[PDB]
Curated annotation (Swiss-Prot), chain A:
It is found in: Membrane; Synapse, Synaptosome. The chain holds residues 178 to 210 of 323 of the full protein. The L-type calcium channel is composed of five subunits: alpha-1, alpha-2/delta, beta and gamma. Interacts with the PDZ domains of DLG4/PSD-95 and DLG1/SAP97. May interact with GOPC. Acts as an auxiliary subunit for AMPA-selective glutamate receptors (AMPARs). Found in a complex with GRIA1, GRIA2, GRIA3, GRIA4, CNIH2, CNIH3, CACNG3, CACNG4, CACNG5, CACNG7 and CACNG8. Interacts with GRIA1 and GRIA2. Interacts with MPP2. This is Voltage-dependent calcium channel gamma-2 subunit. The chain crosses the membrane at residues 5-25. It comes from Rattus norvegicus (Rat). Regulates the trafficking and gating properties of AMPA-selective glutamate receptors (AMPARs). Promotes their targeting to the cell membrane and synapses and modulates their gating properties by slowing their rates of activation, deactivation and desensitization. Does not show subunit-specific AMPA receptor regulation and regulates all AMPAR subunits. Thought to stabilize the calcium channel in an inactivated (closed) state. The gene is Cacng2. Belongs to the PMP-22/EMP/MP20 family. CACNG subfamily. It comes from the Eukaryota.
UniProtKB/Swiss-Prot annotation, chain B:
Belongs to the glutamate-gated ion channel (TC 1.A.10.1) family. GRIA3 subfamily. The chain holds residues 512 to 560 of 888 of the full protein. It is found in: Cell membrane; Postsynaptic cell membrane; Postsynaptic density membrane. The chain crosses the membrane at residues 31-44. It comes from Rattus norvegicus. Homotetramer or heterotetramer of pore-forming glutamate receptor subunits. Tetramers may be formed by the dimerization of dimers. Interacts with PICK1, GRIP1 and GRIP2. Found in a complex with GRIA1, GRIA2, GRIA4, CNIH2, CNIH3, CACNG2, CACNG3, CACNG4, CACNG5, CACNG7 and CACNG8. Interacts with CACNG5. Found in a complex with GRIA1, GRIA2, GRIA4, DLG4, CACNG8 and CNIH2. This is Glutamate receptor 3. The postsynaptic actions of Glu are mediated by a variety of receptors that are named according to their selective agonists. This receptor binds AMPA (quisqualate) > glutamate > kainate. Ionotropic glutamate receptor that functions as a ligand-gated cation channel, gated by L-glutamate and glutamatergic agonists such as alpha-amino-3-hydroxy-5-methyl-4-isoxazolepropionic acid (AMPA), quisqualic acid, and kainic acid. L-glutamate acts as an excitatory neurotransmitter at many synapses in the central nervous system and plays an important role in fast excitatory synaptic transmission by inducing long-term potentiation. The gene is Gria3.
Amino acid sequence: WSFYFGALSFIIAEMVGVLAVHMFIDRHKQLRA
Amino acid sequence: VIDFSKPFMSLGISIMIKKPGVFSFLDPLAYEIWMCIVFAYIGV
């Protein structure tokens, strides 16, 4: 179960990175407007 | 010591030995390869 804990951690880390990149993009689009 | 008739049955010494999955198309590659392919797809 700890191997799959690491795998799930990888998946969640990638999703959270995608969310952070969207927040950065949204901040700069709000700055642009 | 006794009289045998002609053979009523012929025989010899012989050898006796003991006599696809649904998702078997995945068999050429190991399970870890498929899992890491999914992970690499997500990362890419």
